[PDB]
Design a protein around this motif. Structure first.
Motif, short mmCIF file in Angstrom:
data_model
loop_
_atom_site.label_atom_id
_atom_site.label_comp_id
_atom_site.label_asym_id
_atom_site.label_seq_id
_atom_site.Cartn_x
_atom_site.Cartn_y
_atom_site.Cartn_z
N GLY A 2 35.11 44.10 48.42
CA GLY A 2 34.26 43.20 49.17
C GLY A 2 33.62 42.19 48.23
O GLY A 2 32.89 42.55 47.30
N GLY A 3 33.89 40.91 48.49
CA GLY A 3 33.41 39.85 47.63
C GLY A 3 34.30 39.65 46.42
O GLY A 3 35.36 40.27 46.27
N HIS A 4 33.84 38.78 45.53
CA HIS A 4 34.57 38.43 44.31
C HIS A 4 35.98 37.95 44.64
O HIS A 4 36.96 38.33 43.99
CB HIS A 4 34.62 39.60 43.33
N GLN A 5 36.10 37.11 45.67
CA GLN A 5 37.42 36.68 46.13
C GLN A 5 38.12 35.82 45.09
O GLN A 5 39.35 35.83 45.00
CB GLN A 5 37.29 35.94 47.46
#
Lengths: 164, 220, 220, 220, 220
Positions: free
Chosen positions: C60-63
């Motif tokens: 989740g996140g850090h795309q």
């Protein structure tokens, strides 16, 4: 290593014989998996109880339309249609199992079993298997077809599955 | 969910409370973000339609999203019933009757019938079909939750390039219009909306520039 | 991931939800620290490429970092295809499948094909290859997430040597270089950037002194 | 387009550049008017679908009209597919396959396949079908390009009857309606919208008076 | 260009002057527009590489575009040489050696060799390859001569919807980034940039609206 599937054929419900096929999964793997999985019925839908809707004596027996039962339907285990995997294998003689299609990259579930050498089909239909046991059952089936393909009796895949 | 035994056969097993607790907690904590579909597919591997109806009914709140998912499942079941009509009359002894769309959904069938469908010879994958339908519904839901459109992205004068590309790729994964369209977007819109200084630093590298050098250019 | 099952026959066991929850929690709590690489390598021992894809999607996140990881996986697959093309040769008596850059990355390879490539004799190390690729990507990511350069590490006037050497070695571990470069840097940079009060103490000990001697020297 | 070649064997003759230049000129000066459909049908007699695609691509400007034409061709192709299903399977060595809905529009059909479909016995009227589709599209476009409706045509106070009837019949021909409706439309609108003096002059002749008598009434 | 005879065989034919005259006139009069590529493909059907080099060198003016086309042809020729390497060893008696990347252009080969390459058994389509290269170069040229980007389109308060959609589809056909991205653009950017009154009139029909009703809504 290469899967083997069978079909118990029936002519209007009278049992006629078993045809078994070696699928060349080592050269046409995605095509061979689709016929294997449709024969087992493991993905929910398949060949069991479908019929050969077009049999032309001295050319081939075609079947596999389990959705519309007349050559206008069928679907693959990857969606309704998929690419022509490759054309390594050629139509060399009777017993070759090749994919029917409606032009390139339109493979679904229809297949045809050749009862003669049909080199004109090369490069246009993916070959992915050959009859192992049962070619005289395929030959006897020819008698129930016609020049234009129409068959005289209902010819069904009474049961089918994987053997090895 | 079914589980294999020592000799290889499988039989029904009661759903673990830990799975339900983890699913409800991740739905509450992580809301409806792109990373709920992989976790949903991982949590309910081999789950019966009853277990999926459990995991869906148990989601308190966000009832609009659950109604969207129910409507999508209904449309998929109607299309399945239209494409695969069921036969009437007596059923063979060695074969169990094929399920309809409303029964593939698991709404009007018992658990024992689902287990018989899943452990039949050949097995019938009702669980996988209903899981595919739920995954499509969740894709539509995460499409709906998308806060902004892909075209409205413009970096502020002070917003760092890292946050810009984070927001861009977040809403891009939330868009899911296609794959090649996404590939064209990450080439054009990514460099089209940079801050003028770092914008020309990226243009100095040309279109052949990759993302790593694209970031370390504006870095430091 | 596949696991040795009694007796001596490896069978496929799907990834457990608790492992995915542990991975999500370690990525949430620890962000992208140097230690995550070992935690990732230990959480996914002998994992099929599908399991690693699941573990990389559940983040989740850090795309942006995930995008660099995907691009480096693509580059490694491209180089792998370039380094492993089919040159004409007599066909082998025994045929075994073969993993493509896309077959290794788990993009177009079905789970059954990967199980085959792993359990066949001789085995095809698709899992270890994909793990090496993901580990290279994670090294890139953790070397990017470094806030300051190792050359900028300097001790405060009253900052104790304890926190100074801790932060210095942390940034040095996050930094990327050969081992000999690190051996030179720990001898040229560590003592120089220290506080003069304890810098005189470290100089009094000697140039080739070990870490524990200096640490107990400036202790207190 | 194919043409009867001495003796009795049709062979493919590519479209002549002079025909294309005539088409570009008529779509440069005449632009879109009622006369373009007849000119187009005469310039493309017996043309293969590739020739009609070439003649529709060479038009410069008016991209909205070309898009309408392409969309109506797609709609007609979909309707042809829904009415004429194409069965899949191996083709006979002597006869050609039944063309699909997109084989008519020359999108996925090679020139050789079209030549076969046209010269075979019995011939497949692919060219005439695609011409009917393009003619429907051109009728749509020319009925759209109409500046005013037929109900708005009214004669000026001193505007002669000649210009009034010319403009009225031009707008009526550009308009789209069944000929049976036009038979009432003329007898209801031609005399009513005329100048009051000429209105009484035409009403003195009678309701069912022909066009020539009505004209020679107010002549000069 | 080669032409078939009564017996069926083909032989070289001198290029007709009113083809060169028509090409030079259409190049100068229409300058560069999307409708120059179909005219070029129709004018030089079956033309030898010498004829295409003639039709390119004969274009006076716009020398920058011709240099772009020459550079594109140059890069394309290099790729062909790299992709296929000439085989070594003895050559079959019924076969003879092929041309190089630069000789496909016809820069260093006589006309008789081109004719032998085009009428060999089996025939080698050097003319079609060089025509494809020239068509790609002309696509890049008409891309450069585009006067705006696709995103900057915004209809003015008074500019009619017809002119807006004409400009949109003109610069869209001049974009040619892809085909499915074009399909997404014609859905989103076409509806996103309308004038508020007609904008909400189009929104009254929803996304299912087609172009015909889209325009007849704002019509009148």
């Amino acid at each position: 290593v290469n899967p083997t599937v069978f079909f118990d054929i029936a002519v209007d419900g009278e049992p006629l014989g078993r045809v078994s096929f070696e699928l060349f999964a080592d050269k046409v793997p995605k095509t061979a998996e689709n016929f294997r999985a449709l024969s087992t019925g493991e993905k929910g839908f398949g060949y069991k109880g479908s019929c050969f809707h077009r049999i032309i004596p001295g050319f081939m027996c075609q079947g596999g339309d389990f959705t519309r039962h007349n050559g206008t339907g069928g679907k693959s285990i990857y969606g309704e249609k998929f690419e022509d995997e490759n054309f390594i294998l050629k139509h060399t003689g009777p017993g070759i199992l090749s994919m029917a299609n409606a032009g390139p990259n339109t493979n679904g579930s229809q297949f045809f079993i050749c009862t003669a050498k049909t080199e004109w089909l090369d490069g246009k239909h993916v070959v992915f298997g050959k009859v192992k046991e049962g070619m005289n059952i395929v030959e006897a089936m020819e008698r129930f077809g016609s020049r234009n393909g129409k068959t005289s009796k209902k010819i069904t895949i009474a049961d089918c599955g994987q053997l090895e | 969910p079914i589980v294999q035994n020592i000799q290889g056969q499988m039989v029904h097993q009661a759903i673990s409370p830990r799975t339900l607790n983890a699913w409800v907690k991740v739905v509450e904590e992580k809301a409806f973000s792109p990373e709920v579909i992989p976790m949903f597919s991982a949590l309910s591997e081999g789950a019966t339609p009853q277990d999926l109806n459990t995991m869906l009914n148990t989601v308190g709140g966000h009832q609009a999203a659950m109604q969207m998912l129910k409507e999508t499942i209904n449309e998929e079941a109607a299309e399945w019933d239209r494409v695969h009509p069921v036969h009437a009359g007596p059923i063979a002894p060695g074969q169990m009757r094929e399920p309809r769309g409303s029964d593939i959904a698991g709404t009007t069938s018992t658990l024992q019938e689902q287990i018989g469908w899943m452990t039949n010879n050949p097995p019938i994958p009702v669980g996988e079909i209903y899981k595919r339908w739920i995954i499509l519904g969740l894709n539509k839901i995460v499409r709906m939750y998308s806060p902004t459109s892909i075209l409205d992205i413009r970096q502020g004068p002070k917003e760092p390039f890292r946050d810009y590309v984070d927001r861009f790729y977040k809403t891009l994964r939330a868009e899911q219009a296609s794959q090649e369209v996404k590939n064209w977007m990450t080439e054009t819109l990514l460099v089209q909306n940079a801050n003028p200084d770092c914008k020309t630093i990226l243009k100095a590298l040309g279109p052949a520039a990759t993302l790593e050098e694209m970031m370390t250019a504006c870095q430091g």
